[PDB]
Design an enzyme around this catalytic site. Structure first.
Site, PDB file in Angstrom:
ATOM      1  CG  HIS A 151      -0.501   0.102   2.552  1.00 53.36           C
ATOM      2  ND1 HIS A 151       0.180   1.201   3.029  1.00 53.36           N
ATOM      3  CD2 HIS A 151      -0.649  -0.731   3.612  1.00 53.36           C
ATOM      4  CE1 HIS A 151       0.483   1.015   4.304  1.00 53.36           C
ATOM      5  NE2 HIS A 151      -0.014  -0.148   4.686  1.00 53.36           N
ATOM      6  CB  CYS A 169       3.185   0.500   7.404  1.00 50.63           C
ATOM      7  SG  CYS A 169       1.502   0.758   7.954  1.00 50.63           S
ATOM      8  N   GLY A 175       3.410   5.680  10.226  1.00 46.24           N
ATOM      9  CA  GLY A 175       4.762   5.432   9.777  1.00 46.24           C
ATOM     10  C   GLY A 175       5.380   4.129  10.244  1.00 46.24           C
TER      11      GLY A 175
END
Ligand code: NA
Lengths: 305, 305
Positions: B41, B145, B143
């Protein structure tokens, strides 16, 4: 979001851990530049521990008597000295993985990470608080001595703890990196009771702010309290006194949440007097006191190192 | 003695963490040999996330659209592909600190260490369990991820989790390193809720054994029960049914303590039916289910890596 007991990343400290063997005793040492730091009781036999004279015992040791191993490479010892309860072994090679570091003596109530090691190799990492009675509630087995506690701040490692012993009550005792014990403990096999412990009030308040930031608000109320009246209540629950210094340190969290520190104190007063009524806070059925105000900001703002 | 929630030492994983930027989205990647793995993503805009056509979005990207930074070193991207929900960016430099590793898909009830990272830099480390509803109760901000979960076993880092998202209810969801989500979740901005959770019975028993190993014995009773009689109570308290395989897995702890598994089950039954009598177990006022049997052995035997 979410709020967890979070340890510092351990890699910078992993690169400093070595194994130290004297006689038949093996424990861990901390290798910074060309010095290896470890508990001085490594030089004691079981008989020596009954009544050691460390100066005389150290006089009788040679550099060769200390086998220091970094991974599987021997580090040649070229000097040995003592600073309080810590042995300093000068080695012939400086550690190329030495981080930027400081030695600090921490305050009761402050937190740090422990890298638990055996035979110079890391087993695990967890967060500890220095209790008001200067013990820590850790996880330490035989061979763990010389494992260290530390904080990290912008890639500087502040070492604050080196592990020496487990009291018969099952809590843990050690020194700072200058070899001074935290609390009234000594490295000889003699009686040495820990004092009565207390709950770290400013940390409980920090953790309530963490709960509010993460959406737990049921314990907020519209009551007020003075600092003095709060302390009168908290003393009866074996909580440490809250000072105006503690109120100021909670300033940033109070400002972010819009909850005045003394209003959170009124919430805590109600929690102490009434309990949680079957509810939990951040998944806990007890009031947690091993997060500092800075631990809350550090976790909730994504501080890195 | 002592029993703490203990993460694995993180240094081997720290050496693999990088920053990946696509457009104005920055998150973390895992750099192993000459490939960087990260959530796909990262290639979505905010409008894309509403209804992303990932195959089309990937075809529209080129290597220059991906900026990869390993600390202060920019890594040149020379290929890009997609495996399920993970992006694989081939770079022209192999990570010299790549540990021996495996990609593993863990089963619900198993635990792992999370290294929470921001901008490619580690922030902290903590233990998580894969819940039976395939979420984890972590601590993740904007942030985070691409942060990963892992176990270390003998000489091998087994990566099992990559972080993708936080459900509106405040729990966390992600994939294995092959890009397959745990649970029925998807990487798009559509309604998703976790199923109802359940308590990991075999882990609660493991933690009661940890308590006994550490000297807590108040909850032991002289009674024993049958597997069926225990499961009758377990169903009434939203505990998973206990299987013979789970009894077998508790074998080593039962053997060390001399407390048969069905005896401990009788103890757990009394705790569920009557409460904890104002006592704590290993410092907890609730029964804990995020330690596996092997977590207990690893901590209580000082396993190193
Ligand atoms: Na029993």
């Amino acid at each position: 979001s979410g709020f967890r007991k979070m340890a510092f990343p351990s890699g910078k400290v992993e690169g400093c851990m070595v194994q130290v063997t004297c006689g038949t005793t093996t424990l861990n040492g901390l290798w910074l530049d060309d010095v290896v730091y470890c508990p001085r009781h490594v030089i004691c036999t079981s008989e020596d521990m009954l009544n050691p004279n460390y100066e005389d015992l150290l006089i009788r040791k040679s550099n060769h008597n200390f086998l220091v191993q970094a991974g599987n490479v021997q580090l040649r010892v070229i000097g040995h000295s003592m600073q309080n309860c810590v042995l300093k072994l000068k080695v012939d090679t400086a550690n190329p993985k030495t981080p930027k570091y400081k030695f600090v003596r921490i305050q009761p109530g402050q937190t740090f990470s422990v890298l638990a090691c055996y035979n110079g190799s890391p087993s695990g990492v967890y967060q500890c608080a220095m209790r008001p009675n200067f013990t820590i509630k850790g996880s330490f087995l035989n061979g763990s001595c010389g494992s260290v506690g530390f904080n990290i701040d912008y890639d500087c490692v502040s070492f604050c703890y080196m592990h020496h012993m487990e009291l018969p009550t099952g809590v843990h005792a050690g020194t700072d990196l200058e070899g001074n014990f935290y609390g009234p403990f000594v490295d000889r096999q003699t009686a040495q009771a820990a004092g009565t412990d207390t709950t770290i009030t400013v940390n409980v308040l920090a953790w309530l702010y963490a709960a509010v930031i993460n959406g737990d608000r049921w314990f907020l109320n519209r009551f007020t309290t003075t600092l003095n009246d709060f302390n009168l209540v908290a003393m009866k629950y074996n909580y440490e006194p809250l000072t105006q210094d503690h109120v100021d340190i909670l300033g940033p969290l109070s400002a972010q949440t819009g909850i005045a520190v003394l209003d959170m104190c009124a919430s805590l007063k109600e929690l102490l007097q009434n309990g949680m009524n079957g509810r939990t806070i951040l998944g806990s059925a007890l009031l947690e006191d091993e997060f500092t105000p800075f631990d809350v900001v550090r976790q909730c703002s994504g501080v890195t190192f």
